[PDB]
Design a protein around this motif. Structure first.
Motif, PDB file in Angstrom:
ATOM      1  N   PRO D   4       0.923  -1.307  -0.055  1.00 10.82           N
ATOM      2  CA  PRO D   4      -0.131  -0.072   0.126  1.00 10.82           C
ATOM      3  C   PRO D   4       0.847   1.114  -0.204  1.00 10.82           C
ATOM      4  O   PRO D   4       2.103   1.078   0.532  1.00 10.82           O
ATOM      5  CB  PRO D   4      -0.708   0.002   1.383  1.00 10.82           C
ATOM      6  N   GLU D   8      -2.781   5.384   1.365  1.00  8.24           N
ATOM      7  CA  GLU D   8      -3.472   4.517   1.577  1.00  8.24           C
ATOM      8  C   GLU D   8      -3.643   3.859   3.016  1.00  8.24           C
ATOM      9  O   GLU D   8      -4.737   3.627   3.821  1.00  8.24           O
ATOM     10  CB  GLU D   8      -3.386   3.148   0.832  1.00  8.24           C
ATOM     11  N   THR D  12      -6.645   4.223   5.679  1.00  9.61           N
ATOM     12  CA  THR D  12      -7.210   2.970   6.229  1.00  9.61           C
ATOM     13  C   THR D  12      -7.273   3.310   7.763  1.00  9.61           C
ATOM     14  O   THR D  12      -8.184   2.692   8.602  1.00  9.61           O
ATOM     15  CB  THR D  12      -6.485   1.728   6.250  1.00  9.61           C
TER      16      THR D  12
ATOM     17  N   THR E   4      -9.799   3.087  -7.476  1.00  6.83           N
ATOM     18  CA  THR E   4      -8.459   2.900  -7.002  1.00  6.83           C
ATOM     19  C   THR E   4      -8.875   2.658  -5.388  1.00  6.83           C
ATOM     20  O   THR E   4      -9.926   2.927  -4.814  1.00  6.83           O
ATOM     21  CB  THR E   4      -7.890   4.280  -6.847  1.00  6.83           C
ATOM     22  N   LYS E   5      -7.843   2.053  -4.710  1.00  6.90           N
ATOM     23  CA  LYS E   5      -7.785   1.710  -3.228  1.00  6.90           C
ATOM     24  C   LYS E   5      -8.213   3.271  -2.497  1.00  6.90           C
ATOM     25  O   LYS E   5      -8.945   3.028  -1.756  1.00  6.90           O
ATOM     26  CB  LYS E   5      -6.619   1.190  -2.648  1.00  6.90           C
ATOM     27  N   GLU E   6      -7.607   4.131  -2.856  1.00 12.97           N
ATOM     28  CA  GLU E   6      -7.896   5.620  -2.291  1.00 12.97           C
ATOM     29  C   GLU E   6      -9.156   6.033  -2.334  1.00 12.97           C
ATOM     30  O   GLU E   6      -9.910   6.484  -1.501  1.00 12.97           O
ATOM     31  CB  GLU E   6      -6.895   6.584  -2.906  1.00 12.97           C
ATOM     32  N   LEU E   9     -11.439   3.844   0.039  1.00  4.57           N
ATOM     33  CA  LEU E   9     -11.262   4.146   1.432  1.00  4.57           C
ATOM     34  C   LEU E   9     -11.929   5.625   1.868  1.00  4.57           C
ATOM     35  O   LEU E   9     -12.583   5.939   2.676  1.00  4.57           O
ATOM     36  CB  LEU E   9      -9.831   4.541   1.719  1.00  4.57           C
TER      37      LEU E   9
END
Lengths: 23, 29, 29, 25, 24
Positions: D4, D8, D12, E4-6, E9
């Motif tokens: 990550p 990120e 998180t 995207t992971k961003e 989240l």
């Protein structure tokens, strides 16, 4: 150096930790 | 050759505002 | 009217929404 | 998954903190 | 056009804050 964005996210994280600790 | 001190990212400006709001909230109590 | 900026990124839109929610909660609390 | 990004990881943790707040309120 | 992971989240963070505001 860490990015301004990383530093700000770290501050935000820390402010939320503090909120959770004081609630 | 490009600018040495260009404007911060829009992400940075918004994170600043978010930071300020959380900090002010904390400062109330 | 002021110029309409180029299309915002998904990140910018989400961060702006988050900012708005925090402002809203600060204002009503 | 690939490692990550620093952002990120922080996001998180921020998510985790808000979820904790939600559960505790 | 996967998120995207961003994005994933930030979407959850936004939703959690909406929930906080609703329940407060």
């Amino acid at each position: 150096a860490p990015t301004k964005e990383e530093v700000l996210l770290t501050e935000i994280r820390d402010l939320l930790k503090e909120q959770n600790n004081r609630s």
